[PDB]
Amino acid sequence: GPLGSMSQSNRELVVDFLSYKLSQKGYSWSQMAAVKQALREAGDEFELRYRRAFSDLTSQLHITPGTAYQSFEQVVNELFRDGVNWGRIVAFFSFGGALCVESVDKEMQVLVSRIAAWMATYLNDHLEPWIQENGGWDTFVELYG
Amino acid sequence: GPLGSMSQSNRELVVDFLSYKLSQKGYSWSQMAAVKQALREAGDEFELRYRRAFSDLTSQLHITPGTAYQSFEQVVNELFRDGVNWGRIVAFFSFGGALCVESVDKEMQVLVSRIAAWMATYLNDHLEPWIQENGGWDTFVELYG
Ligand SMILES: O=C(NCc1ccccc1)c1csc(N/N=C2\CCCc3ccc(-c4ccc(OCCc5ccccc5)c(C(=O)O)n4)cc32)n1
Numbered sequence A, B: 001g002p003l004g005s006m007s008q009s010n011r012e013l014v015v016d017f018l019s020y021k022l023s024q025k026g027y028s029w030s031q032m033a034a035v036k037q038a039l040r041e042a043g044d045e046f047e048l049r050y051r052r053a054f055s056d057l058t059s060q061l062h063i064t065p066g067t068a069y070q071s072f073e074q075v076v077n078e079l080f081r082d083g084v085n086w087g088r089i090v091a092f093f094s095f096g097g098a099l100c101v102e103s104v105d106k107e108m109q110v111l112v113s114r115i116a117a118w119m120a121t122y123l124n125d126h127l128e129p130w131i132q133e134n135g136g137w138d139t140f141v142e143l144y145g
């Protein structure tokens, strides 16, 4: 009977579950599975204890369906003005999470896919060079896993 | 500089983090993000309290690099002999998790991708019809989320 793109969804569900079960037994599906878990935990710790010290970077953006990457990029550049470090990379993820929650709060969940694409562009273009210079994602997992 | 398939990895990392942050605020990235979290929790509860009651279905398989889907399918059919229900679908995921841990235990992590593909095939072919008949994944999330 008619399955649709649920077939691809079912493949990703299996991978998610198996990744979780391996991690519980001290194994890892992949480097990126280990990074996902370390980043979830690092973000929670940043938001709990450290984010209150900083100005609210989200006050700088009012994302609308007309907002372009360039506006996001100029604001995120403020986090990295005085250099990239792992803590500012964790703050960048937290920031994007807060933009997404704020967008859903304003009944504009349609913008979340845009914010995700912008974050991926900025990560690939601005941060991946520093990450590769500084021991790659394995170093992040060593520090925050 | 040279990025490679890390660009696609970086897109999936962003989605994973944003999904987590939305879920903490009572929002959801997607139906499948909600299913992933409910299935992780359902699997843990099955394994903690209910799996010990059943015979060890993994004793039925000795997966090698020569093992074919047909061998997996005949053993998983035993879980569903007396019908599909949500509990047996949770047990199917737990089963696959246990096969993966056992494969890594035997220094054959190369087989985990195979087990994942077999699980996706069996889910799409044998279980998705029942799932769609029984209110789809939303019903599962309602019961286990
Ligand atoms: O999510 C955000 N705002 C929304 C919000 C949420 C709740 C309540 C109100 C508003 C958010 C994320 S961000 C931010 N502003 N941060 C700025 C302002 C612009 C300039 C700036 C410049 C440097 C840094 C920064 C950030 C993190 C830093 O380190 C984190 C260390 C750590 C890692 C892992 C776990 C815990 C702690 C550092 C640093 O020490 O260098 N420096 C931060 C901002 N706002």
Ligand SMILES: O=C(NCc1ccccc1)c1csc(N/N=C2\CCCc3ccc(-c4ccc(OCCc5ccccc5)c(C(=O)O)n4)cc32)n1
Residues within 6 Å of the ligand: B042, B043, B045, B046, B047, B050, B051, B054, B055, B056, B057, B058, B078, B079, B080, B085, B086, B087, B088, B090, B091, B092, B094, B095, B096, B098
């Ligand atoms: O992972 C497994 N084995 C490896 C293992 C792990 C640890 C230790 C030793 C071996 C495993 C997963 S499975 C299984 N065997 N299960 C079988 C044997 C074959 C026949 C069979 C036939 C029906 C069912 C079954 C399974 C689940 C069931 O419901 C679960 C309800 C629930 C849901 C969500 C959270 C908690 C509980 C039911 C049922 O009540 O109908 N029936 C189960 C097996 N083995």
